[PDB]
Structures are given as C-alpha cells and as structure tokens.
Write an enzyme that holds these catalytic residues in place. Structure first.
Site, short mmCIF file in Angstrom:
data_model
loop_
_atom_site.label_atom_id
_atom_site.label_comp_id
_atom_site.label_asym_id
_atom_site.label_seq_id
_atom_site.Cartn_x
_atom_site.Cartn_y
_atom_site.Cartn_z
N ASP A 25 0.83 -1.20 0.00
CA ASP A 25 0.00 0.00 0.00
C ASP A 25 0.87 1.26 0.00
O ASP A 25 1.24 1.75 1.07
CB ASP A 25 -0.92 -0.04 1.21
CG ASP A 25 -1.93 1.08 1.22
OD1 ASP A 25 -2.86 1.01 2.04
OD2 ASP A 25 -1.82 2.02 0.41
N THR A 26 1.12 1.83 -1.19
CA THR A 26 1.91 3.06 -1.30
C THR A 26 1.21 4.26 -0.67
O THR A 26 1.86 5.29 -0.45
CB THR A 26 2.22 3.36 -2.76
OG1 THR A 26 0.99 3.56 -3.49
CG2 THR A 26 3.03 2.19 -3.39
N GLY A 27 -0.09 4.17 -0.40
CA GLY A 27 -0.84 5.21 0.27
C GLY A 27 -0.74 5.18 1.78
O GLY A 27 -1.32 6.04 2.46
C1 LIG Z 1 -6.92 1.12 4.01
C2 LIG Z 1 -6.96 0.66 2.56
C3 LIG Z 1 -7.54 -0.76 2.49
C4 LIG Z 1 -7.83 1.63 1.74
N1 LIG Z 1 -7.42 3.03 1.96
C5 LIG Z 1 -6.31 3.41 1.07
C6 LIG Z 1 -5.05 3.69 1.90
O1 LIG Z 1 -3.98 4.00 1.04
C7 LIG Z 1 -5.28 4.89 2.81
C8 LIG Z 1 -5.31 6.16 1.96
C9 LIG Z 1 -5.33 7.36 2.89
C10 LIG Z 1 -4.17 8.11 3.08
C11 LIG Z 1 -4.18 9.20 3.93
C12 LIG Z 1 -5.35 9.55 4.59
F1 LIG Z 1 -5.35 10.59 5.40
C13 LIG Z 1 -6.52 8.81 4.40
C14 LIG Z 1 -6.50 7.71 3.55
N2 LIG Z 1 -4.15 5.01 3.73
C15 LIG Z 1 -4.24 4.94 5.05
O2 LIG Z 1 -5.32 4.73 5.62
O3 LIG Z 1 -3.11 5.11 5.75
C16 LIG Z 1 -3.33 5.25 7.15
C17 LIG Z 1 -2.82 4.00 7.81
C18 LIG Z 1 -1.33 3.88 7.46
O4 LIG Z 1 -0.61 5.01 8.02
C19 LIG Z 1 -1.06 6.30 7.50
O5 LIG Z 1 -0.93 6.52 6.08
C20 LIG Z 1 -1.59 7.79 5.91
C21 LIG Z 1 -2.81 7.72 6.86
C22 LIG Z 1 -2.55 6.46 7.70
S1 LIG Z 1 -8.75 4.09 1.84
O6 LIG Z 1 -8.28 5.54 1.68
O7 LIG Z 1 -9.56 3.94 3.10
C23 LIG Z 1 -9.69 3.69 0.45
C24 LIG Z 1 -9.38 4.25 -0.77
C25 LIG Z 1 -10.14 3.89 -1.87
C26 LIG Z 1 -11.15 3.03 -1.76
N3 LIG Z 1 -11.97 2.60 -2.74
C27 LIG Z 1 -12.89 1.74 -2.34
N4 LIG Z 1 -13.81 1.18 -3.14
C28 LIG Z 1 -14.90 0.36 -2.60
C29 LIG Z 1 -16.17 0.57 -3.43
C30 LIG Z 1 -14.46 -1.10 -2.63
S2 LIG Z 1 -12.71 1.49 -0.73
C31 LIG Z 1 -11.44 2.49 -0.55
C32 LIG Z 1 -10.75 2.80 0.54
#
Ligand SMILES: CC(C)CN(C[C@@H](O)[C@H](Cc1ccc(F)cc1)NC(=O)O[C@H]1CCO[C@H]2OCC[C@H]21)S(=O)(=O)c1ccc2nc(NC(C)C)sc2c1
Lengths: 99, 99
Positions: A25-27
């Site tokens: 997870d690069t995010g």
């Molecule tokens: C958690 C993962 C499984 C999904 N997530 C992406 C991850 O990359 C998230 C992206 C993010 C970055 C920063 C943020 F402030 C918020 C969000 N990273 C993340 O939570 O990182 C956390 C923990 C690590 O440490 C830190 O990193 C930075 C924050 C801390 S998601 O954003 O919730 C997301 C995206 C698109 C999407 N489409 C769907 N489609 C459905 C219809 C199936 S569901 C779905 C959910």
C-alpha cells in the site's frame, strides 16, 4: 517482482511466526495488521484513515518477511479491515512505483 | 517516471479544469478526491477505509490527467483527508510496483 495493479497487490508475509496475506500500500505511511498475537511490549496509538480513527498497539523493530524480503520496523496492530504494508517497510524491500 | 517511497508518492493531477496534488495509492481500489466542484451528474455512495465509512458523490467517466498521463474513469468526491488515485486509474497510466 513486478506487480501490475489490475488486482489488489497482495503478498505473503511472515510475522511473529505466522503467515498472513497483506496489501502493498503506497498510500500507507505505516504498516497496519489485523488483530494478532505479537511478541514484546507495545504502546497505544491512534491512526487516522478515510473514515476516522482506530486505536492500535504499536510494536517497534519487528521483523517481517515480505515476499521473501526481510524488513525490520514498526508494525501497528488493530481493527484494520485489511493487512497493510506501508511505506516504512516498502522502502526496506526496495519497492518502487513506475509508469 | 520511477518513484521511490521514502516520501509520499504525490503527483499533480488536472481534473475538472483544476490542478490538485494527489497520492498514488496502490491500496485504494477507487479514486477519492477532496470536496470539489465537478460537472455532471453523480450518485450517492458510501466507501469504507481504516476508520469507518464516508459518504461520497460518485462521478463516472471523468477525465483526469495524472502527471501527464490521461485517464477516464470513476472518481468519488467526499470528505477524504487526502486526494487518492486508486487502482482504477493507476492501471490506465500503466503504473506498476517493483522490488
Ligand atoms: C486502508 C486501505 C484498504 C484503503 N485506503 C487506502 C489507503 O492508502 C489509505 C489512503 C489514505 C491516506 C491518507 C489519509 F489521510 C486517508 C486515507 N491510507 C491509510 O489509511 O493510511 C493510514 C494507515 C497507514 O498510516 C497512515 O498513512 C496515511 C494515513 C494512515 S482508503 O483511503 O480507506 C480507500 C481508498 C479507496 C477506496 N476505494 C474503495 N472502493 C470500494 C467501493 C471497494 S474502498 C477504498 C478505501
């Protein structure tokens, strides 16, 4: 390996003697794993994502094997829906994005 | 380009005539952008991440230019804390993970 993104980029990890699957997870700044039994002492922490915050237990210098590559770093354990390998460990296994 | 992961993998995007920065996120199935004015019709939707769910507006067949690469796909708009380019668009610009 080279991984394309038509499917979720899942890898096998070995951590605390257990095998698990986890998302590259690069995010993700940090590495966040499902509730699991890990050795050692931890610290309470809160991390935020798309929907709000979760409480996690933070463990430092944990050895993980990520698709046959060894890394040591911080792992957070808590109510995440998916096991996430974040950039703190991706950098150690030499992972890059390319396009 | 080749992007290492020592810092957040941020790129510039142009969407709906506006310039934004966004995170290349291999852990995101879909593309989710901060509140912004997009033209056209949308659909209410809820998506889940680490801390719970957010309500988003879903726009389909949206043109984005992501670091000079054009893609058309679905974009969700809502109270995300970071602009996120997910795998539905990463595939289109040919983005791969490598280690
Ligand atoms: C958690 C993962 C499984 C999904 N997530 C992406 C991850 O990359 C998230 C992206 C993010 C970055 C920063 C943020 F402030 C918020 C969000 N990273 C993340 O939570 O990182 C956390 C923990 C690590 O440490 C830190 O990193 C930075 C924050 C801390 S998601 O954003 O919730 C997301 C995206 C698109 C999407 N489409 C769907 N489609 C459905 C219809 C199936 S569901 C779905 C959910």
């Amino acid at each position: 390996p080279q991984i394309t993104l038509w499917q979720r980029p899942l890898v096998t990890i070995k951590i605390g003697g257990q095998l698990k699957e986890a998302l590259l997870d690069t995010g993700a700044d940090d590495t966040v794993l499902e509730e699991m039994s890990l050795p050692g002492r931890w610290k309470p922490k809160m991390i935020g994502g798309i929907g709000g915050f979760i409480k996690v237990r933070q463990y430092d210098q944990i050895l993980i094997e990520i698709c046959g590559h060894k890394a040591i770093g911080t792992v957070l354990v808590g109510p995440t829906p998916v096991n996430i390998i974040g950039r703190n460990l991706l950098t150690q296994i030499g992972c890059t994005l390319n396009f």
